[PDB]
Amino acid sequence: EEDGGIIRRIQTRGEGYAKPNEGAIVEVALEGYYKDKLFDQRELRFEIGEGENLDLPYGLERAIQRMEKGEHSIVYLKPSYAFGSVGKEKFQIPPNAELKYELHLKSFEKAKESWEMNSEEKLEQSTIVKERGTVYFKEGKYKQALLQYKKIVSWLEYESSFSNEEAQKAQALRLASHLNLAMCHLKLQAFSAAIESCNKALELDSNNEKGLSRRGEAHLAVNDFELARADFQKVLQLYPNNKAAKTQLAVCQQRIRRQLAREKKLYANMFERLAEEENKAKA
Template sequence: MAETKNDESSVKSSSPTSHFEMKGDDISPDKDEGVLKEILKEGYDNEQPTSNDKVYVHYVGMLLDGTKFDSSRDRNEKFEFELGKGAVIKAWDIGVATMKRGEICRLICKPEYAYGKAGSDSKIPPDATLVFEIELFDFIGEDISEAKDQSIVRRILSKGESWTRPNDGANVEVLLKGTYEGRVFDERTVNFVIGEGFLKNIIPGVEHAITKMLKNERCKIKVKSKAAWDKSGEKSFNIPPHANVEYEILLKNFEKAKDSWQMNDTEKLDQGEILKKSGSSFFKDGHFRVALKKYSTIVDYLQSTNCESESDKERCRQLKLAAYSNIALCHLKLEQYIECIHACEKALELEAENEKCLFRRGTAYLALHEFDVALKDFQLVLSINSSNSAAKQQTEKCKDKIKLHAAKEKRLYAKIFEKLAKESEQEEPKQSEKTSNDDKSVEVENEHKTSNGTSEKQNDV
């Protein structure tokens, strides 16, 4: 049994069969001497890795008798893992979290913090106490961006509580501290609705990070310009275009928006009407991406409805039709033409002769230079409403584009044929000259045969 000093966190003992002294600070959570740490070389800064950080280390693993069973140094390849996610033995998650960059330490790990009664393969026996010498080279935060392009990198400074996180539409209260090149530009407590953060000058990167947080969690994020103010910058904070920023965030409180599975059909329909009104308001103000999200949520809510009454069924159909139609319009404004066409087709499944959706689909096809297909859509619009002046204009535009395209093709093919004809003319004299030379060769060969009485081919044989 290890001997405890006056300082209960420091332990030193030895065993006659052990190659190592059982010494070091007791860093196990329960102070049961399960993980002892001895620093062999001090690190060079005060920052330590936190949960979810990706860490880069070299290690040598040994049994108590000094037998080496694994070594990243022998492979000449650093080992990397995400801290606190159970990707390694418990002792590592505990021990590496206490290290600094450049630090080398020795961890002595009791079986319950290592491989336990099972051991591991033939190299680590059951109930084995293990020794690891670990060098920490670097650690980086967790990439929480949707594109996994390092545009939003998070480091958890203090863990939160419970297990729920804010969802889209949740009301949140956060304490923010934004810095740019060491200068604090934004420090405040703010309440806002997830999805509408821009109304309070909250950048997308911060809003996205908050949806990954627990109540009372504190984190630090590094945000690239694409998830901040991008090429526009922010004059009120004196942030230039294309600037990367950092934020420290404390999620003080939040109230989740109701999930669709928590609603009955009537509630989904009512919520759909609210979202439609909200989306239209944002659309009128030019916030097309926010409006798009509102309309898309309507579709999500109504996918799983099972309305019983005919009136509710029709109300549901009309809401979905309006949602898809408005989704198409948002995509059109954002110049996302393929997505616009897809949304129009969803709407046309609900109402085949919907004038607005046919027009919007035609407009998207026109933008994609699919003039023939676009023309058909505008002609369909006119067959439904012959007085639609916009469709008349677009029809004429398509016809002009088709004529122009045909003329271009005609000129292109004419050039191709002209080029081929010239190449053919240039080949004819060459062919004629080749034929003449071939005839002369035959005459010479015949003369050669006559003088020698045999051909060169026969002489070779």
């Protein structure tokens, strides 16, 4: 299967049937060695699936998904399932490195899986995760915030057995999830992605001040002024007392103003230089 990439020797079995699943919050006590020299060691409460943002190899989170409460194990990770080709510089680990870890799974809470969730449970796990996400947002842990928000959109997609009331709630969570994902992507300077989320949001509320402004901000951030000017221009029509727009629109006009002056002289010079070659062409 993974052909011995994640090799694990169990030191002290863990009484319990339970094992963590993706999304499970876990309490671990880990020790990381690169050629028996320690390079990682700490007790952390993290969510399976976010380890990459806490400098955990993913073979390690994979290995945690096969442990039991209180268990003590040693995990052997080939370079592929470790920090592979990049290594981790803050841990002096270089490209293509095998790793050994001594983790000890203290406790955990499996995460409810999409299908286990009845209709109103989804409107609930979703609101929970939105908050979890905003929290991450405010701490500046933007990448970790994306994992929470994305969850919402997914969960509330196919599920349609909605009471028309529940429907609206689900629709608002989706609009909220998207506008929030755009904020993240903007903070990560992932503009092309900020526009996608904006568009998705807008497909929900085509007049959304937030979606419009952010999309407009993302275009501008990428120097796509014409499209940028289009969104702030719309934000104004819809929402005149809008500080950012009025200002951002200005920026767009100035740059677009310059842009034309450049281009114009360009054609002028190309024109003239062209006429030149032409006359000489009169042998």
